[PDB]
Design a protein around this ligand. Structure first.
Ligand SMILES: O=C(Cc1cccc(Cl)c1)Nc1cncc2cc(C(=O)O)ccc12
Ligand SMILES: O=C(Cc1cccc(Cl)c1)Nc1cncc2cc(C(=O)O)ccc12
Ligand SMILES: [Cl-]
Lengths: 296, 305
């Protein structure tokens, strides 16, 4: 029993964190094999990069200085070739996630990991993270079996306190650019398929007060979702919730009618899994994994 | 900017997790140097749990009855002893991944990270607090016994909790790493119930100071309170009494924001009376009590927005 916001064990990622310094800027880098990946804002980026030589980049792994032997740019990420391959390099892939998908963030300062937390890529492509100055280059990841899938690298904080970054190939999530300009996050929406997954997790843990005898259609529900700034629920979302529906005996559109009533009436002083708000940062897979005990 | 429930990086603890098997029971162990620490209930059957005599059950065991697995390698058990509710298994290999560590016993209200494990394999990490009733609201399934709670301050891992059991309400009970339980609990299948739980007042205050640091002041008011008047009201909402020690501990956060502890106590009194009126504080519609004053200072910026 119990339901917590749970991150993947960060050990395989901790062994890759390094400190990168260029001039007065100090941020974090990801050391995989003989390459260190970091935000290019550490340095017209091509014009600024041509003026830098290998010895201008200071890379520190723990108490050891790594020797930079090459440098190249891929989109908004700088790739620093080093002389030493990271002996702690785990099995890994670079993956681009979609809004609604969750991941763990290992927040770092000066190449030293300070905390790990779980979060979701919002529909507006921002992340509601917890980052201070020096956190740039901190990474987001998932673990599947023994393989680390790197999906995010932190680049910047927006005026509202939300965060923006790129995949590990340097492509931003969202209509953001790596520069100090008037940039604002778009209006955000609630991740509907994730709220439904979290309602199934509540039923599994013995919280059934919000269940009712009613069912609905995808059409009727999507009109309600549009009214309360909820993302549209697709037939793919319904299919993905199939296993949880089979386990609890509550059809996905039966649970949609429960969510419709919660949106139109509130919780009436009650909570669901110790929360007075509808939680949308657990995917259907997260709910199944946490309510099964999958290890890494 | 931002405020999240944050756990310590679990790497230093992952390198210590092993699987311990005794007969049909399989649970987790903590391998530090040449000793593996695990719940002593690993020697019990389900039947034994009603009234187990652990000394009688242990004297019948030999070293080779305990199977210890670290990754894909079998560790050889060369000794065994019991210390309170923990079994200490001497092994023939010191853990090369042993971090710098201490065993610390925490008090209610203190927070820590939990590395949840099954079969000596870590599956997840989360942050939680030792409740005033000495239970933890964790997330554990069968096989999680032996999972540990810890804090990492600088490069030293302070182990403070080892998971032993789940209570009828779904809450969890366990021991420090010397085998002493937190709370009036026993590692026995008997009628045990958690005492009535209360809100950790000093932690809710710390979290209200974190909200002010991140730019939110809607809940502040022009009032103050005496410490005794605050406690007479707070105890009516099942809040723990605030002591002079708690007021002293909140001193740095009071100095940083310019809001006296007893003025923050007045905002809390008003919040309890009125509710939030559709508003949130740090993205939450409830008053959060699982961040200590120390956690807030660690996670927040030294410059108030
Ligand atoms: O956004 C920047 C710098 C920057 C500026 C223009 C373009 C780019 Cl790509 C990057 N840095 C920060 C990233 N994350 C959290 C941050 C918290 C703080 C803070 O809490 O003080 C300050 C800076 C923070
Ligand atoms: O409590 C026990 C075994 C036990 C029994 C009587 C006394 C003691 Cl000391 C220990 N094991 C479990 C520990 N944690 C979470 C657990 C969740 C579940 C569950 O959710 O199914 C089951 C068992 C769980
Ligand atoms: Cl303590």
């Amino acid at each position: 029993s119990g339901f917590r916001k749970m991150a993947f064990p960060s050990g395989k990622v901790e062994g890759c964190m390094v400190q990168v310094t260029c001039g007065t800027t100090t941020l974090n880098g990801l050391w995989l094999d003989d390459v260190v990946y970091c935000p290019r804002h550490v340095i017209n980026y091509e014009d600024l990069l041509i003026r830098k030589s290998n010895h201008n980049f200071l890379v520190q792994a723990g108490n050891v200085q790594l020797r930079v032997i090459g440098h190249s740019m891929q989109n908004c990420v700088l790739k620093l070739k080093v002389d030493t391959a990271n002996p702690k390099t785990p099995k890994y892939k670079f993956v681009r996630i979609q809004p609604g998908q969750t991941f763990s963030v290992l927040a770092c300062y000066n190449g030293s990991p300070s905390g790990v937390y779980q979060c979701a890529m919002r529909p507006n492509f921002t992340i509601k993270g917890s980052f201070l100055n020096g956190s740039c280059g901190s990474v987001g990841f998932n673990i599947d079996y023994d393989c680390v899938s790197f999906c995010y690298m932190h680049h910047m904080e927006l005026p509202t306190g939300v965060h923006a970054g790129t995949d590990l190939e340097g492509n931003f999530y969202g209509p953001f650019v790596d520069r100090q300009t008037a940039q604002a996050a778009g209006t955000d929406t609630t991740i509907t398929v994730n709220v439904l997954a979290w309602l199934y997790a509540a039923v599994i843990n013995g919280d059934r007060w919000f269940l009712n005898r009613f069912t609905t259609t995808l059409n009727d529900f999507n009109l309600v979702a549009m009214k309360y700034n909820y993302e549209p629920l697709t037939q793919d979302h319904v299919d993905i919730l199939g296993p949880l529906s089979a386990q609890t005996g509550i059809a996905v559109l039966d649970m949609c009618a429960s969510l419709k009533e919660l949106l139109q009436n509130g919780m009436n002083g009650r909570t669901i899994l110790g929360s007075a708000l509808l939680e949308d940062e657990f995917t259907p897979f997260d709910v199944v994994r946490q309510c099964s005990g999958v290890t890494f």
